[PDB]
Subunit: 142 residues, 4 copies
């Protein structure tokens, strides 16, 4: 099994306040599950080769996704911003596989990644535990 | 807009305790978002013709999905039990669309539905508010 | 230390739906903390001789408290129903101590307790793990 | 009635990650209730003259309380850091009343308050809606 535990840090009220609106899990490697404990979010996966996505919406209406998973026994992550209402996590998650237009960032196996949406909201995924089967990452909104 | 607010009732400790492990939203009708308030779960949709799925897992390991949405301005629902690890909600949700294998129960626009898993766990989705754009349903595990 | 993990089962929609509105921890035994994990609630205490209270409110307006703790190395529990808005958990919890009017039920060290409110709501606390430092109980609204 | 809705912003992963471990409501003004919606926390009170406390614990062991209420029709707030484990919210909340050691900061009716714990963690409560019966504050950990 692989697990990825996330801590959500939101740094700038000027960017509004984000909450989770969707949680998906891709079907590879026997799938997996999202759980909550002590204000954190853990994706537990049946093996290497799958992932899950959390979609966030701010109280200002901004939509963004955070994808985390394990590819070839190494953690990966991605952030997609400027999403439209119809571009749900259910749309986004599969795009990382089957030669989708996002598979390339998965193959990068990034232990850290950041991007700034066009509206000026910075997002970052940063693994604090980058090795082994019990991975840990901070998700930082700013 | 169409919203569906769910109250989860678990009646029989002998069946274990279920918790949400996934929450998807289908991309039709401008998509939508899940939110939580006062222990309830609300699916807010940008119009008629879309849906979302909650996948539950018991602490005994039983996996089931609850689907709710609006089709042609009328609420619909379905429950799938005996799910395998790889049959995530991300897999199940799209199966109701594009003439998928589950599109038939959606077209039924059910205001109530119940079913019992082969392992003996009863599941019921009963709408308490069956009309309008602010729908209410009880999810009952037994 | 001692921990008490609670699973909340709501059995009858006719009685309304309850959500937590308050969580207290008494200051004896070096205090303690409430946490949440996978839909369950755990009270962690620094030792024997303290307790915690969860206050619930139904969407019908009913107010009740669930008290759990460890007295002389044995678990105890109590349920108070028909509470007035001013009778917060902060008021109720201390009443089990210092010769308060509720101390007697703490001293009973009950592994199980049920009561039915004047308005007809049944409540039960039933420990499933009754001994040791890691106690488990079901909380049943009916 | 009065309500105070809180958005929690955690800015610095170096300070650890905080989660709620207790929520109390003082018994004045006919009491009140805590609720959760879309990742925010709302304290609803039966009138002016009461309050409630949120105690947080970081995954680094830091214990702090945030107090918010309404005094003489004006919002107030306070933050206490460096708490011992026996100093539960149940102990701290009443200290703002009956001429307790914290009554003085309640009387200040502050719309903003910040303080840094001896161990280096900055805490701030800043109301964004400072007037009326529907108050809004950001709670910022740094
Ligand atoms: C369908 C669509 O709009 N595709 C992309 C759009 O998502 C977009 O976003 C980037 O997506 C990559 C790969 O998933 C991310 O690493 C990156 O963070 C996204 N960029 C931003 C600014 O959010 C753009 C740019 O590649 O191109 C559209 O076609
Ligand atoms: C891949 C798979 O799961 N195949 C079949 C299952 O879908 C399946 O269940 C039934 O699906 C209907 C349509 O979604 C539901 O309305 C119905 O409640 C559900 N039945 C149960 C008992 O869960 C099972 C059992 O029919 O067969 C599989 O082959
Ligand atoms: C201030 C007040 O109303 N006090 C009494 C109530 O608490 C009360 O309740 C009973 O308190 C017992 C001890 O805590 C509980 O074990 C018991 O379950 C509870 N009874 C019910 C029906 O909830 C009433 C009635 O006994 O008397 C009040 O004076
Ligand atoms: C730094 C801090 O948290 N200040 C609090 C203030 O704190 C207390 C500490 C630190 O000054 O001093 C102790 O003597 C006090 N006694 C006990 C038993 O804790 C303790 O309260 O309290 C005031 C009033 O609540 C707050 O406004 C400051 O933020």
């Amino acid at each position: 099994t692989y697990s990825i535990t996330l801590r959500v840090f939101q740094r700038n009220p000027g960017r509004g306040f984000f909450s989770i609106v969707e949680k998906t899990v891709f079907h590879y490697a026997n799938g997996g599950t999202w759980s909550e404990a002590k204000g954190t979010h853990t994706l537990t996966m049946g093996g290497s080769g799958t992932s899950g996505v959390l979609r966030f919406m701010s109280d200002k209406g901004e939509l963004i996704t955070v994808a985390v998973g394990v590819h070839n026994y190494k953690r990966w992550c991605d952030v997609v911003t400027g999403l439209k209402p119809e571009e749900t996590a259910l749309v986004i998650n599969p795009q990382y596989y089957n030669n989708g237009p996002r598979a390339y960032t998965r193959e990068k196996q990034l232990a850290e990644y950041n991007v700034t949406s066009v509206v000026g909201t910075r997002f970052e995924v940063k693994y604090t535990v980058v090795e082994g089967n019990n991975l840990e990452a901070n998700v930082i909104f700013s």
